[PDB]
Design a binder for this molecule. Sequence first.
Ligand SMILES: CC(=O)[C@@]1(O)CC[C@H]2[C@@H]3CCC4=CC(=O)CC[C@]4(C)[C@H]3CC[C@@]21C
Ligand code: NA
Ligand code: NA
Length: 131
Amino acid sequence: QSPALIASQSLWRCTQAHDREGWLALMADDVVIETPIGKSVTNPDGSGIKGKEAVGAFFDTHIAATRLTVTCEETFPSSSPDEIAHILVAHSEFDGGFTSEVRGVFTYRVNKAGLITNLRGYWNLDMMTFG
Ligand SMILES: CC(=O)[C@@]1(O)CC[C@H]2[C@@H]3CCC4=CC(=O)CC[C@]4(C)[C@H]3CC[C@@]21C
Ligand code: NA
Ligand code: NA
């Protein structure tokens, strides 16, 4: 298991389990999350959520109060142990019964310490469905 794979798998587990401190412990201090890449509700300025403090707020907003299910459809290693890509399906269920689901490419990068520096998602609203 490469550092990138272990990091991505650990982040899935901590995400579904709402494990805030475990989730943040996987992040580098200069982490940048772009889920999705470009402007969106989860990426306001379209340039990503930057720094552990900001992704902490991101967690509290979009993960903490949501039942999340992350399915790994397919994994694409690179020739670098520090970078990996996944086809993921992210299903959200909020307090009330409202749901959203999306499927896209997610790329991960870790530093030499094995901490996530980049998480980037390839999808848009057209690929989303709601229930
Ligand atoms: C509530 C929402 O809008 C979403 O459910 C739609 C897509 C979701 C991504 C999917 C990718 C992912 C994989 C991880 O390993 C960490 C958690 C994230 C970033 C996760 C956060 C919540 C998001 C943004
Ligand atoms: Na590094
Ligand atoms: Na550095």
